[PDB]
C-alpha cells in the first residue's frame, strides 16, 4: 500500500486497476473477453 | 520442488506443478521462491512471472498484480490477477498507453486516481518492460 | 434471491445487493468490485460469514459458509501471526485480494 | 625532531584512509543489495551510487592531501 | 511574560558581574539566546490555546 | 565563601517559585499572573507523564521533581559565565551524591548485596549465573551513577568550549570582527545543537533509569 | 620537542576523520536502500540524508579543526 | 617531554571522534531506511533520532573535552 | 619520559571511546529500524534500548577510567 | 625509557576495547531487530544474546588483561 | 631502545583484537536475527555461528600470539 | 632520526589496510544476501561486486604505496 | 633507534588484522542470514563464503607480511 491504503486503493482497487490496465492493454480479442472473464459485471442492485 | 499453483481467475497455469522456482515480482523485490515457503502472503507487483519450473522452464508471463501466497509447505499459490503470457499482451499498446498514461497522470489529480495512473503508467511501462 | 428471502427479513442491514448474478453469469471483476465495497462499509471489522451455495453436483450444493478473513485484525495477531514472516499489511492486502477471490468463487459456486 | 617528526606524522595521517576504504564497501555494497530488490538499476540507484562514492572519497581527498603536505 | 523577561535580564547581569566574562564568551551566548526569542514569541502565542482552554473545558 | 554560598540557594530558588505557585492556583485568582505561571507544571504534567506509569502512581511525582530540577539547573548554567568551567563543575559534583543516592533509596538500601533483585532480575544480568549478576551490577548501577555525573559534565564541556574557542578566536583575530565573525557565527549556532539537545537527553536518562528500578520493584 | 611532537600530533588527529568517511557511506547507503523500497526520492529520505551527511561530516570538521590547530 | 607529549596526546584523544562520526552515520541511516517503511516521520521515528544523535555525539563531546584538557 | 608518557598514554585510551560511540549508533539504529516494524514502541524494544546502550557504554566508562588513571 | 614505554603501551591496548564496545552494540542491535520480528523473547533468541555478549566481551577482557599487565 | 620498544610493540598489536570482538558481534547478531526468520535453530544455522565465531577469533589468536611474542 | 622514523612510520600506514579488509567483507557480504533474494547471479549482481571490491581494495593498494615509499 | 623503531614499528602493522578479523565475521554473518533465507547452502552460497573470506584475509596476509618484515 503505497497508495493502496495511502491514497486509497485496496488491494482490490490497486489490483483491479492493474487488471483493468491489463484489459486496457492486451490485444482486443482478449479484451472482448475481458468484460466477460473477470470483467466486473456486478449489478449493484439491492433487492 | 514446489507445487506451484499459479492461477489467475481465468487460468490456472501451473497447479501444484513441480516448479523449482518462480521469480516473483512480488511487490517485495526480486525474489525467486523455490519449493516450500514460509507462511507469508506477499502481494504481487505487476511484473513478469517467470516460472522456473524445476526443469529449466521459465514460463513467461507478465502479471498484473495479485498475491503470492506462500504456504509454509511445498506449495506456492500465485494468485495473479491478470497474469498473462506476454503473447497476448500488446507492446504497441504499452507505449501508446504509456503516452496516454502520461496524459492521464496529469489528470490523475488525487493520489487515489494517481495511484491508479501511476499504476497505469507503471503498468504500461511494465508492459514496456517486456513489451 | 438471497435477499429475496432474507430481503424478506432484513433490508438496510444490507449495504448493497447484487443482481446480474443470474440473468447472465458472474465474473471475478464483480467479485473484486463487491470485495472493494465490503471494505468501506465498516461492517467490515465486525466480521461476517460468507455463505454461498457450494455446488456438489448439478442437483446439489451444500450451502456453504465460511467466516470472513478480509479483516486485518485476523491479519492481526493471533497464532496467525506466528505463521508469518511478513507483516499484516501485505497479508491485509490479501484480506483484500482474497475477498475478491473467494467472493468470486463462492459467487460462482 | 624537525625532519624526523615529519616522517611519523604523515604515516598516522595515512590510517585515515580506512574510513574511505570501508565506506566505499558499505556504499557499493548497499547498491548491490538494492538492485537485487530491483529494477531501477540504470539511473536512480547506480546514479546515486556515484553521489555516495564521491562523498566517501571526499574524506579520501582530504586525508591524502594531508599526508602529501607533510611530505614535500 | 514581562516578569520572565525581567528575571532573565537579572541573571545576565549576575553573569557579567562574575569574575571572568569576556566579549566572545558573552557574544556567543547572547546571540544563542537571541535566536530563540523570535521563534519563542510565536511559540508562546501558539502554545497558549491548549492548556487554559483545556482547563476551562474540563 | 560568598560566591559558592550565593549559588546553591539561587538554583534552589528558581525551582522553588514554580513549586509554590501551582499549589496556590487551586482556586484563585487568577489574573494574568497565576494562569501564565500555571503553564509551567502543565508542561511537566503533560510531557513527562507520557512515559510514567509505567512504574505506578506511587513513585511518579517523587522522580518528576528531580527530572525538572536537573533540566532547570543546566538552564541556570547556560546563560552565566564565567560559570561553566568552575561553578557548573562544582554543581555537577554537588549533584553527584543525589544521583548516587537515587539508586540507594530503593535498591541498595533494601539490598546492597544484590540491588539487581529490585532493578532487573532477568534481563541484562543472567539469573542462571549469579557471577554475571554481580559483574553487571557495575554496568547497571555503580558505573551509570558515575556516568550521570559525566552526563551533565559533557554538556558542561561542550558549552565551555563554545565560549573558550569563541574567546580565543576573537582574541587571535581582534580585527573587529572581522574574519572571526564567520567562525563565531557557527559557535553561536552550536549552543542550540549542543546544549539545547543534550540538556533534554540528560534528564531523559534520569527518567529511564529510575523507571527501570521502580517498575520491577 | 616543541616543533617535533606537534607534527606527530596532527597526524593522529587526521585519524579521527576515519569515522566521517565510513559514516558518509553508512548514511548515504541506507538511503540507497531506502529508495529501493521507493518512492520518496527528492521528498523525505533524500532530504534527511543531507541532514545525515551534515551530522557526520561535522564530526569530521570538529576533527580537521584539531588537525589544523596542531599545524598553525 | 612535558611540553611535547601533551601535543601528541591531544592527537590520540581526537581519534575518539571516529565513533561519534561513524555512530551518526549508523543512526541517521536506520532512520532513513526505517522511514522508507513509513509513515512515522514526525513525533515518533525522527523524534527518537534526536535521542539517537544525543547518545552518539555524547561520546564525542567526552572525546573533545579530553583533547581540550591536553591543550588548555 | 616519566612525566611525558602519562600524557601520551591518556590520549591512547581515549581512542577506545570510538567503539562505544558507534555501538550506541548501532543499538539506537536497530531500534529506529525496530520501531518501524511496529507496534510495541513503549516496552520490549525501546525499553531494551537503554539495556543495549548500557553494556555498550560499559566499554567506554571502563576505557575512560584507564585514561583518567594515567592523568591522576 | 623502561619506566616510560610501559605507559605508552598500556594505553594503546585500551584501543582494543573498540571491538568489544562496537561488538556489544551490533550483537544487541540485531537482537533488538530479531525480537522485533517476534516472538521468542523469553529464551531462544535473547538467551542467545547472552551467548553473543560473552563471546564479544572475551575479546575485551583479554585486551584489558594486556593493558593491566603493562601498568601493574 | 631495546627494553622500551618491546612494550610499545605489544601495545599496538593488541589493537588487532578490535576486529575479533566486533566481528563476533556481527556473526552472532546475524545468527540472532537469522533464527528469528526461523526454524533451523537446533541445527544448520546455529551450527554455522560456531564456524563464524571461530574464523573471527582466528584473527584474534593470531594477533594475540604477536602480543605474547613481543612480551616474553 | 632519518632512518629510525622511517621504520615506525611505515607501520602506521599499514593500519590503512584495515578499511580495505573490513570493506571487502561488506562488499561480498551484501552480495551474499543480495543473491539470496536472487536470481541474477552471473551478470548484474556479481558484476557489481567486482566493480565494488576494486573500489574497496584501491584504498589498500594506495595505502601500500605510501607504506613502501617509506621503506623503499 | 635501529633496533628500537623496528620493534615498535612491527607492532603498528599488527593493527591491520583488525580489518580482516571483523571482515571475516561479516562475510560469515551474511551467509548465516542468507542460508536463513534458504536453501542453496552447499554450492552457490556457502561456496561463495570461501571467495569472501579469501579476498578479506588477503589484506590480512598483506598486513602480516609487513609486521614480519620488521621482525625478521
Short mmCIF file of C-alpha atoms in Angstrom, two decimals, chain F residues 25-111:
data_model
loop_
_atom_site.label_atom_id
_atom_site.label_comp_id
_atom_site.label_asym_id
_atom_site.label_seq_id
_atom_site.Cartn_x
_atom_site.Cartn_y
_atom_site.Cartn_z
CA UNK F 25 -3.52 28.24 41.67
CA UNK F 26 -6.24 25.95 43.05
CA UNK F 27 -8.91 28.43 43.33
CA UNK F 28 -7.69 31.96 42.95
CA UNK F 29 -7.08 34.31 41.27
CA UNK F 30 -6.02 34.17 38.51
CA UNK F 31 -5.46 37.47 36.75
CA UNK F 32 -2.61 37.42 34.21
CA UNK F 33 -0.07 36.11 36.73
CA UNK F 34 -1.32 32.78 38.08
CA UNK F 35 -2.52 31.39 34.76
CA UNK F 36 0.70 32.33 32.96
CA UNK F 37 2.81 30.54 35.59
CA UNK F 38 0.35 27.61 35.86
CA UNK F 39 1.54 26.61 32.34
CA UNK F 40 4.90 25.52 33.74
CA UNK F 41 3.66 22.47 35.68
CA UNK F 42 1.10 21.86 32.93
CA UNK F 43 4.05 21.24 30.55
CA UNK F 44 5.69 18.97 33.18
CA UNK F 45 2.43 17.02 33.82
CA UNK F 46 1.92 16.89 30.00
CA UNK F 47 5.35 15.93 28.66
CA UNK F 48 6.88 13.65 31.31
CA UNK F 49 3.64 11.81 32.18
CA UNK F 50 3.55 10.31 28.67
CA UNK F 51 6.28 7.88 29.91
CA UNK F 52 5.24 7.47 33.55
CA UNK F 53 3.05 4.70 34.93
CA UNK F 54 4.84 2.54 33.69
CA UNK F 55 6.14 2.35 37.29
CA UNK F 56 2.89 3.36 39.00
CA UNK F 57 1.35 6.45 40.58
CA UNK F 58 3.28 5.97 43.86
CA UNK F 59 6.82 6.76 42.73
CA UNK F 60 5.89 9.11 39.87
CA UNK F 61 5.83 12.59 41.42
CA UNK F 62 8.92 11.89 43.56
CA UNK F 63 11.06 11.39 40.42
CA UNK F 64 9.49 14.20 38.33
CA UNK F 65 10.81 16.77 40.87
CA UNK F 66 14.42 15.64 40.19
CA UNK F 67 13.91 15.40 36.39
CA UNK F 68 12.72 19.04 36.36
CA UNK F 69 15.49 20.09 38.79
CA UNK F 70 18.27 18.63 36.55
CA UNK F 71 16.97 20.38 33.40
CA UNK F 72 16.39 23.70 35.24
CA UNK F 73 19.86 23.55 36.88
CA UNK F 74 21.54 23.17 33.45
CA UNK F 75 19.48 26.15 32.13
CA UNK F 76 20.92 28.22 35.03
CA UNK F 77 24.40 27.22 33.78
CA UNK F 78 23.60 28.25 30.16
CA UNK F 79 23.43 31.95 30.17
CA UNK F 80 26.03 32.63 33.08
CA UNK F 81 29.67 32.80 32.57
CA UNK F 82 32.00 32.71 33.77
CA UNK F 83 30.26 29.87 35.28
CA UNK F 84 30.68 26.67 33.27
CA UNK F 85 34.37 25.85 33.95
CA UNK F 86 34.21 26.22 37.78
CA UNK F 87 30.72 26.84 39.19
CA UNK F 88 28.85 24.34 36.99
CA UNK F 89 31.59 21.73 37.67
CA UNK F 90 31.16 22.21 41.45
CA UNK F 91 27.37 21.88 40.89
CA UNK F 92 27.92 18.65 38.86
CA UNK F 93 29.96 17.35 41.85
CA UNK F 94 27.29 18.68 44.28
CA UNK F 95 24.58 16.87 42.23
CA UNK F 96 26.83 13.75 42.24
CA UNK F 97 25.68 12.43 45.64
CA UNK F 98 21.92 12.86 44.82
CA UNK F 99 22.47 10.78 41.63
CA UNK F 100 24.31 8.03 43.57
CA UNK F 101 21.74 8.22 46.41
CA UNK F 102 18.87 7.85 43.88
CA UNK F 103 19.70 4.15 43.38
CA UNK F 104 20.20 3.69 47.16
CA UNK F 105 16.68 4.84 48.17
CA UNK F 106 15.03 1.63 46.92
CA UNK F 107 17.87 -0.54 45.54
CA UNK F 108 20.99 -0.64 47.72
CA UNK F 109 19.22 0.38 50.98
CA UNK F 110 16.95 -2.70 50.88
CA UNK F 111 19.51 -4.97 49.15
#
